[PDB]
Ligand binder design. Structure first.
Ligand code: CLA
Ligand code: CLA
Ligand code: CLA
Ligand code: CLA
Ligand code: CLA
Ligand code: CLA
Ligand code: CLA
Ligand code: CLA
Ligand code: CLA
Ligand code: BCR
Ligand code: SF4
Lengths: 160, 80, 61, 34, 30, 735, 74, 75, 41
């Protein structure tokens, strides 16, 4: 399909990889005894390996000639769960972190001892700001509009 | 020998003179600051370039500046 | 400018260039740099104050 | 004198004699006075 | 296979290029 | 203790050994010499250029002579795929009998030639050891010409003035038209006249060239306008190079792709290429104004280029006087262009091999690519260093400013913080995520579950490959489609040759790529961005910063500003070059590692080894380095030795020089001055040695000198060890 | 701190080790006193140290020291 | 580092190993220390390159953590 | 317990607690839904 890849559900090398891993795990399982915790752990390993391979097969995942899932990150929504949705999730979380950090910096920057409140965090104010970051996309595009997001010329510059 | 220049931002706090390890700087009368004194560099032939003088300078970007130049047995700190 | 006034540093070779400081005292004598300004941010040498000329400081409204 | 004797004539010549004379000249030059 | 005459005259011409090199070297001064 | 640094009285008065060290390292900085004028500067640079070109020509003549005398060029002509080219003979008295026997080739111990000169000279039509001797003779004559010119232009009546040196329009017209176009025209003349018949078995030498027609019709179609006649009857697909079997009569053709036998570009293709380039450059060489009232005045062109809305300030008004009066701006521009050009040479001479039987010479392919990429990195770092030098010592803010507003160059110092911050952001972004994906693959594969690897298909780059005709990724885009206008347009000119070459598994033309290629390309991008960040930061911050707002008053290269203000180690612009050299070496190492591993897997046939193991770091460490280092380290063992013994010795030598660089970089001065003082006391207080005393007081190397020496050791060891590894691994793995 | 470290070592020998199995077969069982939780596929680190045990092989020689001390039980 | 390298190679090459029932001593490496530890190339090849095989081939096995720590320590 | 709570509000203790909590919920997500190469949706 895309880039010459093929779905992993029809990739023979993918099933060969699964079979080889299961065979190695079973051979390891053979050298232990009865329902002893080592055998239980190896059986859990086998079950998890089978579940992971089955989930990857039924996941709209494209496999190359090596039988490994390749990620299609050109931007198409068909393979949108590989990069685009995790990209949105990370952008949300990281914007949350950056927004709460910036808000805390600007909030304790207007107190008597701004530097003290950076090594000794005001946990009440920190908790107040941190749970308010869920609106960071909206807060950012409400502070940029008001001109409160960017400094203009009070920023310092070197000699040249 | 290195070159040492004094600039009128001098506040005459004498910290440069009392930090020179080779007696290069001295305090001379002046009328450009409250202390009425300014640093001078009349013995730059003994300047070693250690820059202790400008480590003790409190003015914003220094009032004593050391420009390293030609080397001499005195400026290289050679006891041999 | 006077004691307690807020000024912007116009000296380019300054750790507080384009920044705002608080005037501690403006000397009335014939010194070259009478304006003494105190800043909240220490420079690279650790000091937080410096003497500036009358044309190197601009009062903030 | 064949052409195959040229390496044995030249390699010692260059790689030993030229360093010696070059060192002599360079040392004399850099140790001069005025 | 090149002859002795071919190598010899190439060596002689190389010498001439060497005398031209020191003349340029000395003209670029001490 | 005097008279050695004739150009510097300040150094000549130094009583220490520092005078000798600094005399070497400041000999070519003519602008800093005592009693210095601009006219003398340009004249000395001109003479030095002449001497340099003479050196280059002498080096080429030496290569030609040594191939003609001690090589096996004539034997290699008759069997280019089995006979290994010989560079020159070996006479080393330290050889044992075993070393003599192992290095013995034909009549004397000799070195295989990895420069690819055999294929290059064979392609351009050389078939005899007397053709090489003629070339060596002619090149020594040219070297003599250049040395005579260099001497002449220092004579009183022949020394050019500043106006002649700064005559931009004349030099551009002549350089472009004459140099580029006319040299391409002469090269097309040689290509056709000599090379084309020599590839077809007809000898065209310096005797029968006024009587052997390069084309049967003989200049009639050119004047008649029937230029298609020179393309009729090209070389067939069964043509044996250097022989008349299956040859043709055409001299200028479009064929595309490679020769079916030599697996290299068609000679008629390259002749046509050089003819087109010659015409284009000769035309473009008439642009600028000279004594005949027509042309361009580049000052006016630069001044008139200000966007009307206004986003580049006042435009390029002050750039003409800025560039003309600065030799470091021009040097930086030339070095950047040369670096890009040699990167292009490296990237195209492996994908599109231009010389006969060079594709099957794997060691020379690897050596050429590595050599040109390292030269490219050096040239780029030099361009940025000279830009920084221009900022320090040649940049004038007044010239680049008109009534407060700043021109296009002066505005680069206004948003310098923005530029540096965004370079830092890109570098951190790429490094964080490339290392994250690589370490994720490392951990996931190590835990025995390679299916959980993050493998991103390089769809953007595969899209480009499909656009050029590669039907491997099922894109059907531009030239992978037979119905697209891009394909119908050239279906009769060069697609059949181009498609037959791009869609071939044995070529290096557009090598198939996978997730490993994606990750390594991102690593390369990170290296480029970080090297650019260091160099741009050093260039822009050269004139000053917050830690040193008067850095321009201390020059381009100074040790520091002292321990005050928190510490100012490596604060000069020279130190930025010094730090960026490590990153350039690392980036070129990544590029060359990627190229060499990809091509080793391609040549050996186990391309699946790269496609699987290149996604994680341990894959690289185990399957490239550890795997291919086995032939190299066994160049000599307690049992014997091979012709690869010299490469193992060079491997160890490079490691040793690298670690001596580590000495000079980690341990700084001050620790070496006191030790030297102890040694001085020991010498002064011992009998039978008091009779001998130094003239220059022995002192430790200066901080900047120590940084330079450590960098030189680091770089020399790096280059030597990698050259030894790549060459020995290719030779010992691929027969 | 040192006493806490020693207490941790002895606790791992008592609870997460094959010391009893190693006592009966010192020459064929590899000493292991740290088992690894089964997360993110890291359970491969639990090696076949012998004695019906899975874990990381121990190179600190605590098993031999405990045997020299006469410790025969966990 | 040199001391521990000397110890490791010398022990593996000339002390440690197995003893056959008839009394024949076979070592881990095979006595290569005596003749190949006298050159830097010998140390590079017969010790570093040779005994680093287990570290680089540890991926997928229970010693994979050692390969990961090898790479991380290089980093 | 007025200065002890202020000590717990210091940068190292707060960073250690936050990173321990963060690693904790990451590890537990990866335990309950292991081997997640793509988005679950
Ligand atoms: C939490 C506040 C915060 C915010 C909003 C930013 C924002 C930014 N940083 Mg930054 N930075 C921060 C903290 C922060 N940083 C810290 C703590 C460090 C020290 C490691 C850095 C080091 C740093 C460098 C070296 C660079 C940036 C850059 C940047 C810019 C591009 C984004 C980037 O590259 O991220 C960079 C982010 C990191 C390197 C990781 C940050 C480390 C953690 C995740 C942040 C700290 C969280 C904090 C403890 C939360 C406490 C708040 C709570 C008490 C309420 C952007 C302006 C780049 C730039 O200039 O581009 C324009 C750049 O080159 N930053
Ligand atoms: C720059 C080009 C160059 C280089 C690197 C070499 C390199 C070498 N030559 Mg050589 N050679 C060259 C050009 C060159 N040749 C030319 C043009 C000729 C024709 C005259 C010869 C003729 C020649 C002979 C006859 C022999 C060598 C030999 C050798 C080897 C031992 C060195 C020696 O004895 O030199 C001796 C070299 C000469 C007598 C000729 C002079 C070399 C050129 C003209 C000078 C180039 C100078 C260079 C540009 C910069 C000089 C730097 C200096 C100021 C320090 C060595 C591999 C020997 C060999 O093969 O041993 C196995 C040997 O017997 N060469
Ligand atoms: C191009 C460079 C070059 C060349 C051509 C040589 C050549 C030689 N080296 Mg040498 N070497 C060099 C660089 C070079 N070296 C460097 C840079 C190093 C340091 C890394 C060494 C370190 C080195 C060592 C440690 C040794 C050599 C030895 C030798 C000799 C080989 C052994 C042999 O069979 O001779 C046998 C030698 C003889 C039969 C006698 C030769 C004595 C000299 C060289 C003859 C010179 C004649 C001269 C014109 C006399 C002038 C007149 C005088 C009577 C007043 C040979 C003369 C070996 C040797 O012979 O030691 C002396 C040896 O042990 N070299
Ligand atoms: C037709 C007349 C002519 C010719 C042939 C030359 C030739 C030359 N001049 Mg020159 N000059 C001329 C007229 C001419 N000049 C005039 C009229 C003036 C006065 C205004 C000058 C003033 C002058 C100065 C002041 C200097 C020279 C120098 C040089 C030399 C440059 C070094 C060299 O060998 O480059 C050889 C280069 C080539 C053979 C071609 C390079 C090929 C490039 C790298 C490939 C590019 C291809 C492509 C664009 C790559 C990019 C890919 C693309 C997709 C973008 C060269 C021999 C310099 C020198 O060394 O002096 C001795 C020097 O300092 N000249
Ligand atoms: C055609 C290109 C070109 C030209 C004309 C120049 C010209 C100049 N450069 Mg420049 N440069 C270049 C390329 C170029 N460079 C490149 C590519 C780089 C990046 C590496 C640099 C980096 C650079 C720096 C950082 C500096 C210069 C400086 C200078 C100026 C003085 C040079 C000097 O004193 O030399 C001195 C020459 C030496 C010290 C000799 C060094 C020789 C090296 C160490 C190699 C020798 C070892 C050799 C390989 C031995 C082999 C070992 C063996 C065992 C294998 C001069 C205007 C200096 C300056 O002040 O400019 C104003 C300066 O600070 N350049
Ligand atoms: C393996 C060795 C190594 C590594 C990892 C780095 C990493 C870095 N160097 Mg660096 N450097 C090195 C060796 C190394 N250097 C050496 C030997 C030199 C010669 C002195 C330099 C000289 C140098 C200069 C001059 C500059 C850098 C810069 C950078 C940063 C580039 C941005 C980046 O990749 O962010 C991603 C960071 C990483 C991938 C590494 C840290 C991430 C860890 C693993 C996080 C772990 C958290 C627990 C980064 C921190 C540039 C910089 O600061 O850019 C902002 C810069 O200006 N370095
Ligand atoms: C000081 C030395 C030391 C060291 C290095 C360790 C290290 C370890 N112990 Mg441990 N332990 C120690 C002392 C030590 N312990 C002592 C003194 C005791 C007696 C109270 C214990 C009792 C103990 C038990 C009962 C368990 C461990 C477990 C563990 C492992 C997982 C720890 C974990 O995830 O906690 C995370 C801790 C936090 C997030 C708190 C912050 C780890 C290898 C566990 C293990 O191996 O599981 C199989 C386990 O179940 N330890
Ligand atoms: C700080 C983050 C964090 C979070 C959000 C959770 C969340 C959870 N843990 Mg938990 N846990 C954590 C850290 C964390 N754990 C740490 C640091 C340890 C010690 C290593 C444990 C040890 C632990 C055990 C032993 C159990 C849980 C269980 C649970 C689940 C029910 C309670 C829940 C999903 C329980 C569960 O769901 O298992 C069935 C359970 O039995 N946790
Ligand atoms: C920086 C690059 C990078 C990226 C993009 C990833 C991405 C990934 N890694 Mg990975 N990894 C990295 C670096 C990276 N890693 C490094 C440096 C290491 C070495 C320590 C590892 C070691 C590693 C292991 C050992 C494993 C992964 C796994 C995974 C996957 C599961 C992620 C997960 O738990 O989601 C689920 C968790 C979240 C989405 C957390 C966010 C949830 C919040 C609470 C949502 C709340 C808001 C609504 C994912 C594809 C696992 C896997 O299955 O691979 C396929 C796995 O087993 N990685
Ligand atoms: C510091 C400085 C300097 C330097 C700088 C530098 C060094 C730079 C570099 C630069 C560079 C190095 C750049 C590069 C560039 C490149 C480019 C710009 C490219 C382009 C390309 C293109 C555009 C292409 C296109 C295309 C495609 C893609 C496809 C095919 C076809 C075509 C052609 C269409 C100087 C001295 C000047 C001055 C001072 C400052
Ligand atoms: S360097 Fe600075 S301190 Fe040392 S002598 Fe000269 S002036 Fe006084």
């Amino acid at each position: 399909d895309i880039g010459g890849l093929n779905p992993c559900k029809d990739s023979e090398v993918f099933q060969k990889r699964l079979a080889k891993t299961v065979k190695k795990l079973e051979n390891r399982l053979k050298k232990y005894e009865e329902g002893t915790p080592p055998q239980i752990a190896i059986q859990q390993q086998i079950t998890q390996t089978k579940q992971r391979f089955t989930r990857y097969a039924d996941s709209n995942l494209l496999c190359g000639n090596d039988g490994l899932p390749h990620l299609i990150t050109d931007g198409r929504w068909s393979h949108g769960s590989e990069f685009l949705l995790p990209s949105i999730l990370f952008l949300y979380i990281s914007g949350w972190i950056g927004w709460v950090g910036r808000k805390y910096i600007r909030t304790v920057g207007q107190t008597s001892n701004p530097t003290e409140k950076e090594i000794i965090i005001d946990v009440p104010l920190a908790i107040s700001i941190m749970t308010s970051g869920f609106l960071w996309p909206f807060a950012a595009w409400q502070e940029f509009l008001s001109g409160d997001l960017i400094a203009s010329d009070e920023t310092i510059t070197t000699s040249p | 020998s290195h070159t040492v220049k004094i600039y009128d931002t001098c506040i005459g706090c004498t910290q440069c003179v009392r930090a020179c390890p080779t007696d290069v700087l001295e305090m001379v009368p002046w009328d450009g600051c409250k202390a009425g004194q300014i640093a001078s560099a009349p013995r730059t032939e003994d300047c070693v370039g250690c820059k202790r003088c400008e480590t003790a300078c409190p003015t914003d970007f220094l009032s004593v500046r050391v420009y390293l130049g030609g080397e001499t047995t005195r400026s290289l700190g050679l006891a041999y | 400018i006077q004691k307690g006034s807020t000024v912007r540093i116009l000296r380019k070779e300054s750790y507080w260039y384009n920044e705002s400081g608080t005037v501690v005292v403006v000397d009335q004598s014939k010194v070259r740099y009478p304006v003494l300004v105190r800043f909240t941010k220490v420079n690279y040498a650790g000091t937080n104050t410096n003497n500036f000329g009358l044309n190197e400081v601009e009062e903030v409204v | 004198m064949s052409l195959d004797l040229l390496p044995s004539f030249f390699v010692p010549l260059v790689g030993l004699v030229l360093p010696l004379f070059s060192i002599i000249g360079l040392f004399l030059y850099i140790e001069k006075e005025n | 296979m090149i002859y002795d005459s071919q190598v010899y005259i190439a060596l002689v011409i190389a010498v001439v290029a060497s005398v031209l090199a020191i003349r340029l070297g000395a003209t670029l001064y001490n | 203790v005097y008279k050695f640094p004739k150009f510097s009285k300040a150094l000549a008065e130094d009583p220490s050994t520092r005078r000798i060290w600094y005399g070497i390292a400041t000999a070519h900085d003519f602008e800093s010499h005592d009693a210095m004028t601009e006219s003398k500067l340009y004249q000395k640079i001109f003479a030095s250029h002449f001497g340099h070109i003479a050196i280059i020509f002498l080096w080429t003549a030496g290569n030609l002579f040594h191939v003609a005398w001690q090589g096996n060029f004539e034997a290699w002509i008759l069997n280019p795929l089995k006979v290994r080219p010989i560079a020159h003979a070996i006479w080393d008295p330290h050889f044992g009998q075993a070393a003599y026997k192992a290095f013995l080739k034909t009549s004397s111990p000799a070195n295989l030639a990895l420069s690819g000169v055999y294929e290059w000279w064979y392609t351009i039509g050389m078939r005899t050891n007397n053709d090489l001797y003629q070339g060596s003779f002619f090149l020594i004559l040219l070297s003599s010409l250049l040395l005579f010119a260099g001497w002449l232009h220092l004579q009183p009546s022949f020394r050019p003035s500043l106006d002649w040196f700064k005559a931009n329009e004349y030099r551009l017209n002549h350089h472009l038209s004459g140099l580029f176009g006319v040299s391409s025209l002469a090269w097309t003349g040689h290509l056709v006249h000599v090379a084309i018949p020599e590839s077809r078995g007809i000898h065209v030498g310096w005797d029968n060239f006024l009587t052997v027609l390069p084309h049967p019709e003989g200049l009639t179609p050119f004047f008649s306008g029937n230029w298609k006649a020179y393309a009729q009857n090209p070389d067939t697909a069964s043509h044996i190079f250097g022989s008349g079997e299956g040859s043709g009569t055409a001299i200028l053709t479009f064929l595309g792709g490679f020769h079916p036998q030599t697996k290299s570009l068609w000679l008629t293709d390259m002749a046509h290429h050089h003819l087109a380039i010659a015409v284009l450059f000769i035309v473009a060489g008439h642009m600028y104004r000279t004594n005949w009232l027509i042309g361009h005045q580049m000052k006016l062109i630069l001044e008139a280029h200000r966007p009307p809305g206004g986003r580049l300030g006042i435009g390029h008004i002050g750039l003409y006087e800025t560039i003309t009066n600065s030799l470091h701006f021009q040097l930086g521009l030339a070095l950047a262009a040369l670096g890009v050009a040699t990167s292009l040479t490296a990237q195209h001479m492996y994908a599109l091999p231009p010389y006969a039987f060079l594709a099957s010479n794997f060691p020379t392919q690897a050596a050429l690519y590595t050599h040109h990429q390292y030269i490219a990195g050096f040239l780029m770092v030099g361009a940025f260093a000279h830009g920084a030098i221009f900022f320090v010592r040649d940049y004038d803010p007044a010239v680049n400013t008109r009534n407060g507003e700043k021109n296009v160059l002066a505005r680069m110092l206004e948003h310098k913080e923005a530029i540096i911050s965004h370079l830092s952001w890109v570098s951190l972004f790429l490094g964080f995520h490339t290392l994250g994906i690589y370490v994720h693959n490392d951990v996931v594969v190590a835990f025995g579950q390679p299916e959980k690897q993050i493998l991103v298909e390089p769809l953007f780059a595969e899209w480009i490959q499909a656009a050029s005709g590669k039907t491997l990724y099922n894109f059907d885009l531009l030239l992978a489609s037979s119905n697209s206008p891009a394909s119908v347009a050239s279906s009769q000119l060069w697609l059949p040759g181009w498609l037959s070459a791009i869609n071939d598994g044995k070529n290096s033309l557009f090598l198939p790529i996978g997730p490993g290629d994606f990750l390594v390309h991102h690593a390369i991008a990170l290296g480029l961005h970080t090297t650019t960040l260091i160099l741009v930061k050093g260039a822009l911050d050269a004139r000053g910063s917050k830690l040193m707002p008067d850095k321009k008053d201390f020059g381009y290269s100074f040790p520091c500003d002292g321990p005050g203000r928190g510490g100012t180690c490596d604060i000069s612009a020279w130190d930025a070059f010094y730090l960026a050299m490590f990153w350039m070496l690392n980036t070129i190492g990544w590029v060359t590692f990627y190229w060499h591993w990809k091509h080793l897997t391609l040549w050996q046939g186990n391309q699946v080894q790269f496609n699987e193991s290149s996604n994680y770091i341990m894959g690289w460490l185990r399957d490239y380095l550890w795997l291919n280092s086995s032939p190299l380290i066994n160049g000599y063992n307690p049992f014997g030795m091979n012709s690869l013994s010299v490469w193992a010795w060079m491997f160890l030598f490079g490691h040793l020089v690298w670690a001596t660089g580590f000495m000079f970089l980690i341990s700084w001065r001050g620790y070496w001055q006191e030790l030297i003082e102890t040694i001085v006391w020991a010498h002064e207080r011992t009998p039978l040695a008091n009779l001998v005393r130094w003239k220059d007081k022995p002192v430790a190397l200066s901080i900047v000198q120590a940084r330079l020496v450590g960098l030189a050791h680091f770089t020399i060891g790096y280059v030597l060890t990698y050259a030894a590894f790549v060459i020995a691994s290719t030779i010992g793995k691929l027969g | 701190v040192i006493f806490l470290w020693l207490s941790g070592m002895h606790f791992h020998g008592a609870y997460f080790s094959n010391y009893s199995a190693w006592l009966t077969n010192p020459t064929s069982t590899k000493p292991s006193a740290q088992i690894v939780w089964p997360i993110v596929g890291q359970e491969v680190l639990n090696a076949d140290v012998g004695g019906n045990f899975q874990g990381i092989q121990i190179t600190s020689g605590f098993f031999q020291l405990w045997r020299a001390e006469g410790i025969t039980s966990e | 580092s040199i001391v521990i390298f000397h110890f490791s190679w010398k022990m593996q090459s000339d002390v440690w190993g197995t003893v056959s029932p008839t009394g024949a001593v076979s070592h881990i490496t095979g006595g290569n220390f005596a003749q190949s530890s006298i050159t830097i190339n010998g140390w590079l090849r017969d010790f570093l390159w040779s005994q680093a095989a287990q570290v680089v081939q540890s991926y997928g096995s229970s010693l994979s953590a050692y390969g990961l720590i090898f790479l991380g320590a290089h980093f | 317990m007025k200065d002890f709570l202020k000590y717990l509000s210091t940068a190292p203790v707060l960073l250690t607690a936050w990173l321990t909590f963060t690693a904790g919920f990451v590890i537990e997500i990866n335990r309950f839904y292991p081997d997640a190469l793509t988005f679950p949706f």
